[PDB]
Amino acid sequence: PDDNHLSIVTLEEAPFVIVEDIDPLTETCVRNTVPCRKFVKINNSTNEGMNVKKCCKGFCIDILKKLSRTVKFTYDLYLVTNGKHGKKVNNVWNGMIGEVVYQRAVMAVGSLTINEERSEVVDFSVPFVETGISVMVSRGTQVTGLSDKKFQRPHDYSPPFRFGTVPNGSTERNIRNNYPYMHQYMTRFNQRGVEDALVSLKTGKLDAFIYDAAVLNYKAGRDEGCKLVTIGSGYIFATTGYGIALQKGSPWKRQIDLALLQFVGDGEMEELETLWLTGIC
């Protein structure tokens, strides 16, 4: 109960975190949403900016709501502005990871992948969504997985496969560490975001998109005509999960872990999965 009003950072990534504009007449978030603020700059010649009141919802926001109630904390939720999920740049963490490392946030809640390098600088909860690295293609495209030789040695094929990721996250880090030739080749096809990547696929400009498995599976399930698919038997390289990142030695981790495991045991996680993640395909 003591010092239980917590700074919490998140990051938009549907359906895990969805950001809406607040009703301006009321400045109240309604329904299934929670208040979340975003620092927006006045201009680019200045550090001056203002917090905009927004509204947040989604799978991870419902997790936060349950945690808040179960673990008995209140919070001030904000959207990260210094980068995205988390990357080490010149030995300095940005994104949600950076916000936790440098103690601006007590925890980070979102589509944040647990990996070894982040685990060195933050504590992670137990995984609450299963993920890893999947590959999305148009139905019928024959590729075995990340490990396919069309990815590993692309210039052995004529024409070579055109494939990319969204840079600066856990997926790109993994490819950079494991498959150097693939990685340097892929940078040509880097995508600004998931939406751009899906458009590139649907119009024939990219042959595959390599990305977080949970997000790809979601997008595959919502795809018009069920053209975009993930390869293999729901297949995932480097199986991991999303985790709540907490500061090293955090006193909140114990209770957050138990709560998450209780949600799994109680069927509450399955309910959330059915609410947010089920698709037509």
Partner: protein, 275 residues
């Protein structure tokens, strides 16, 4: 020097007799890595536990060796004396199985297909998952069940026998669940001492459905064509390394597991022992 506890559970842990000279049969897929593991020769209920050297290998044993080389520790392995995974029972409250052995200091680390759950996490430290799986149902190639919501499970009788393994975290979950009541208590009447006994009992038409780990059941059906899984994965969850809360190895165990997922080692183990 760490005391490791594990349990017989193919394809994670194979258990075979030593040769007459007390070493393990040389086998090949690349050499199969094997360790000496002590275990009881009497499996029975309420019996004296006479320990004997045996040979242990498989996915969990390869994982152990990787951990020990990575983190520079020595070990001795033994099979859990009571043959069980571990549940908490009223005596006021006591853990059996591998959970009991770790909490008492008989083991320093559990390396086994041990499900991470709330009830165990209250008392021990689990690593990040070394395997993601869930529950499924094993039946005779022949039987037709939709899955866990079939009437014959939901509203059961002595007509259609099904069960899980005793003192597993499946078993106590069914006995405990309110909507499970009629199946909860029904499985109590038929639950088995081990997974191996349950699987053979399905082949010999003594057990019609066996509710258990998908990682074990899918493997069993891949090998024995008279067996099949049915229904979707449910209760998706992980296996974790188990340690006491004050273990000094806990951070490095998790980092090593994360490293192994990311560098393809866990996938290699899946291709060696599971695929």
């Amino acid at each position: 020097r760490l005391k490791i506890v594990t349990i017989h559970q193919e394809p994670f842990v194979y258990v075979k007799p030593t040769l007459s000279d007390g070493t393990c049969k040389e086998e090949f897929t690349d050499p199969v890595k094997k360790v000496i593991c002590t275990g009881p020769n009497d499996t029975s209920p309420g019996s004296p536990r006479h320990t004997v050297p045996q040979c242990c290998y498989g996915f969990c044993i390869d994982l152990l060796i990787k951990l020990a080389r990575t983190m520079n520790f020595t070990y001795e392995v033994h099979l859990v004396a009571d043959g069980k995974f571990g549940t908490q029972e009223r005596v006021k409250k006591e853990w059996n199985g591998m959970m009991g052995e770790l909490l008492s200091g008989q083991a320093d680390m559990i390396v086994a297909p041990l499900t991470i759950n709330n009830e165990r996490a209250q008392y021990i430290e689990f690593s990040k998952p070394f395997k993601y799986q869930g529950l499924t149902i094993l039946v005779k190639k022949g039987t037709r069940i939709t899955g866990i919501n079939d009437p014959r499970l939901r509203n059961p009788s002595d007509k259609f026998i099904y069960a899980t393994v005793k003192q597993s975290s499946v078993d106590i979950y069914f006995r405990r669940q309110v909507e499970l009541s009629t199946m909860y208590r029904h499985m109590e009447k038929h639950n088995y001492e081990s997974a191996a006994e349950a699987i053979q009992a399905v082949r010999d038409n003594k057990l019609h459905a066996f509710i258990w780990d998908s990682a074990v059941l899918e493997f069993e059906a891949s090998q024995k064509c008279d067996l099949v899984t049915t229904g979707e994965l449910f209760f998706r969850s992980g296996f974790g390394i188990g340690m006491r809360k004050d273990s000094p190895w806990k951070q490095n165990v998790s980092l090593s597991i994360l490293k192994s997922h990311e560098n393809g080692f866990m996938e290699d183990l899946d291709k060696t022992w599971v695929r």
